[PDB]
Design an enzyme around this catalytic site. Structure first.
Site, mmCIF file in Angstrom:
data_model
loop_
_atom_site.group_PDB
_atom_site.id
_atom_site.type_symbol
_atom_site.label_atom_id
_atom_site.label_comp_id
_atom_site.label_asym_id
_atom_site.label_seq_id
_atom_site.Cartn_x
_atom_site.Cartn_y
_atom_site.Cartn_z
ATOM 1 C CD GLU A 41 -3.032 -0.557 -0.068
ATOM 2 O OE1 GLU A 41 -3.600 -1.550 0.415
ATOM 3 O OE2 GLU A 41 -2.984 -0.334 -1.298
ATOM 4 N N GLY A 134 -17.045 4.288 -5.180
ATOM 5 C CA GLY A 134 -16.265 4.987 -4.177
ATOM 6 C C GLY A 134 -16.081 4.219 -2.882
ATOM 7 N N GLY A 136 -13.858 1.844 -2.332
ATOM 8 C CA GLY A 136 -12.469 1.497 -2.094
ATOM 9 C C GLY A 136 -11.956 0.321 -2.908
ATOM 10 C CB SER A 139 -16.172 2.019 -8.678
ATOM 11 O OG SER A 139 -15.884 3.219 -7.987
ATOM 12 C CG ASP A 184 -6.408 1.683 -8.059
ATOM 13 O OD1 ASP A 184 -5.567 1.019 -7.413
ATOM 14 O OD2 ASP A 184 -7.149 2.536 -7.522
ATOM 15 C CE1 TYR A 234 -2.863 9.424 -4.634
ATOM 16 C CE2 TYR A 234 -3.447 7.579 -3.221
ATOM 17 C CZ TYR A 234 -2.842 8.070 -4.366
ATOM 18 O OH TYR A 234 -2.217 7.203 -5.245
HETATM 19 O O1 HFK Z 1 -17.253 10.942 -6.009
HETATM 20 C C1 HFK Z 1 -16.591 9.809 -5.701
HETATM 21 C C2 HFK Z 1 -15.216 10.231 -5.110
HETATM 22 C C3 HFK Z 1 -14.409 9.041 -4.674
HETATM 23 C C4 HFK Z 1 -14.286 7.948 -5.814
HETATM 24 C C5 HFK Z 1 -15.606 7.633 -6.534
HETATM 25 C C6 HFK Z 1 -16.405 8.864 -6.948
HETATM 26 C C7 HFK Z 1 -17.673 8.550 -7.759
HETATM 27 C C8 HFK Z 1 -18.309 9.688 -8.521
HETATM 28 C C9 HFK Z 1 -19.738 9.480 -8.952
HETATM 29 C C10 HFK Z 1 -20.504 8.464 -8.066
HETATM 30 C C11 HFK Z 1 -19.974 8.445 -6.657
HETATM 31 C C12 HFK Z 1 -18.531 8.029 -6.569
HETATM 32 N N1 HFK Z 1 -17.655 7.152 -8.277
HETATM 33 C C13 HFK Z 1 -16.299 6.777 -8.778
HETATM 34 N N2 HFK Z 1 -16.268 5.583 -9.336
HETATM 35 C C14 HFK Z 1 -17.254 5.097 -10.302
HETATM 36 N N3 HFK Z 1 -17.138 3.937 -10.898
HETATM 37 C C15 HFK Z 1 -18.243 3.758 -11.759
HETATM 38 C C16 HFK Z 1 -18.623 2.698 -12.624
HETATM 39 C C17 HFK Z 1 -19.813 2.811 -13.373
HETATM 40 C C18 HFK Z 1 -20.636 4.014 -13.250
HETATM 41 C C19 HFK Z 1 -20.266 5.028 -12.412
HETATM 42 C C20 HFK Z 1 -19.036 4.924 -11.637
HETATM 43 O O2 HFK Z 1 -18.401 5.732 -10.732
HETATM 44 N N4 HFK Z 1 -15.287 6.727 -7.633
HETATM 45 O O1 GAL Z 2 -1.873 1.827 -2.116
HETATM 46 C C1 GAL Z 2 -2.466 3.079 -2.300
HETATM 47 C C2 GAL Z 2 -3.345 3.053 -3.530
HETATM 48 O O2 GAL Z 2 -4.435 3.942 -3.226
HETATM 49 C C3 GAL Z 2 -5.409 3.934 -4.219
HETATM 50 O O3 GAL Z 2 -6.488 4.638 -3.745
HETATM 51 C C4 GAL Z 2 -4.793 4.567 -5.471
HETATM 52 O O4 GAL Z 2 -5.719 4.664 -6.523
HETATM 53 C C5 GAL Z 2 -3.636 3.676 -5.965
HETATM 54 O O5 GAL Z 2 -2.954 4.260 -7.080
HETATM 55 C C6 GAL Z 2 -2.614 3.429 -4.825
HETATM 56 O O6 GAL Z 2 -1.831 4.574 -4.583
#
Ligand code: HFK
Ligand code: GAL
Ligand code: J4Q
EC number: 2.7.1.6
Length: 390
Positions: A41, A134, A136, A139, A184, A234
């Site tokens: 990590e 979101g 972890g 996604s 990722d 981060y």
């Molecule tokens: O705002 C957060 C901040 C932290 C990281 C996280 C985002 C959002 C933004 C919009 C929705 C809530 C979370 N989602 C993404 N990932 C994501 N993967 C997806 C796959 C299919 C469709 C939609 C998708 O949104 N990661």
């Molecule tokens: O191990 C920490 C990890 O944290 C994730 O959230 C990030 O997307 C990766 O790139 C890596 O830094």
């Protein structure tokens, strides 16, 4: 444990939604998984070692080329912000795409913006996902890689897989404002069923490490919390690591060992020293973990996971009372080899390596010993990005 839908079921959901939305069956289908990091990590942006595996949780995208240079999107994902649809024209030399609302479309926009091949046509697409948004488990990386995989069918690139991960990584940086490392996206692209993936983030060498034992399982526990620090702290860690490498005359913390770090203690801050010690130690533990994993030494692997978490909690300080309590509860369950926070930190998921027979007992105990509401995933190592012609 949450049911976890197979590809064929997500595909069918995506297909039906597309048909209803655009009046025709889709022509193409792609998928890309989320990830769990077994160990290593906050090393990937330090040019260290990581050992993630791809999950059965995935983002599925079905679509077709258009002739009008227009991009038209629909998502059915629970958690996606409004609106669930968005249309925009392709970027041009004189006008580039831009991050905005809805937020979920920035990931798609980003990949399109930095897609290296031409000519890219417009397209229609439906997005579905079993990866918790979101939560972890990356996604977004799955969305980016699915998008990249889709664009490859519309307009084949001609580069490496690392070049692809880096495009997806650039989208995360520029369009989502998260300056992530390469892990990722890389595991999402390159995972293999039954394997974890050792990634050297300096040389970009990768190695498929077997991880397929009926007596062994990987329990993912979602804390269902996400402190704002997950986003804001981060990039701070990346600067702190850079500042330590700068003071030691090193290109990255990969070139620094604990002893060299010891000798230069009066050359960095107390806090910087703690940051660098985690990284250096974590890089070592990931090499040890990989070796332990090869010769089937699960007890050693587990112990190395526990050291990883303690390090993340005390030296890099990217844990939280939620994750900690989830970890302590996990280590109290018979049959559990090890447990640690996974991913960025400050919430998200823990990963636990256990005997398969202990998973039911571990889920009940962890949940009861957890102050919030935990969500559970029992996942095997899955494949990376795939394509299916419809
Ligand atoms: O705002 C957060 C901040 C932290 C990281 C996280 C985002 C959002 C933004 C919009 C929705 C809530 C979370 N989602 C993404 N990932 C994501 N993967 C997806 C796959 C299919 C469709 C939609 C998708 O949104 N990661
Ligand atoms: O191990 C920490 C990890 O944290 C994730 O959230 C990030 O997307 C990766 O790139 C890596 O830094
Ligand atoms: C979920 S997200 O990170 O894609 C997003 N939601 C609203 C805006 N952005 C991106 C923005 C944040 S900072 C610089 N780029």
């Amino acid at each position: 444990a949450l049911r976890q839908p197979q590809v064929a079921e997500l595909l069918a959901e995506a297909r039906r939604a597309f048909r209803e939305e655009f009046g025709a069956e889709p022509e193409l289908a792609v998928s890309a998984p989320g990830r769990v990091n077994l160990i290593g990590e906050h090393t990937d942006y330090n040019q260290g070692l990581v050992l993630p595996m791809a999950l059965e949780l995935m983002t599925v995208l079905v679509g077709s080329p258009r002739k009008d240079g227009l991009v038209s999107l629909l998502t059915t994902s629970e958690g996606a912000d409004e609106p669930q649809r968005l249309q925009f024209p392709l970027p041009t030399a004189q006008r580039s795409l831009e991050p905005g609302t809805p937020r979920w479309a920035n990931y798609v926009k980003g990949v399109i913006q930095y897609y290296p091949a031409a000519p890219l046509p417009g397209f229609s697409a439906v997005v579905v996902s079993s990866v918790p948004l979101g939560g972890g488990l990356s996604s977004s990386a799955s969305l980016e890689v699915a998008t990249y995989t889709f664009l490859q069918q519309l307009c084949p690139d001609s580069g490496t897989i690392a070049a692809r991960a880096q495009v997806c990584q650039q989208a995360e940086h520029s369009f989502a404002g998260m300056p992530c490392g390469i892990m990722d996206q890389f595991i999402s692209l390159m995972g293999q069923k039954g394997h974890a993936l050792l990634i050297d983030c300096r040389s970009l060498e990768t190695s498929l490490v077997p991880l397929s034992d009926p007596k062994l399982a990987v329990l993912i526990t979602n804390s269902n919390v996400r402190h704002s620090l997950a986003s804001s702290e981060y990039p701070v860690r990346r600067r702190q690591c850079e500042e330590v490498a700068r003071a030691l005359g090193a290109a990255s913390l990969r070139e620094v060992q604990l002893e060299e770090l010891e000798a230069a203690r009066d050359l960095v801050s107390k806090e910087g020293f703690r940051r660098a010690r985690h990284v250096v130690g974590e890089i070592r533990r990931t090499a040890q973990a990989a070796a332990a994993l090869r010769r089937g030494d699960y007890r050693a692997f587990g112990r190395l996971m526990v050291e990883s978490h303690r390090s993340l909690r005390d030296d890099y300080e990217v844990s939280c009372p939620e994750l900690d309590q989830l970890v302590e509860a996990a280590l109290a369950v018979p049959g559990v080899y090890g447990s640690r926070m996974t991913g960025g930190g400050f919430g998200g998921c823990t990963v636990t390596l256990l005997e398969a027979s202990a998973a039911p007992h571990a889920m009940r105990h962890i949940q009861e010993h957890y102050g919030g509401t935990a969500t559970f995933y029992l996942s095997q190592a899955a494949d990376g990005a795939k394509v299916l012609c419809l």
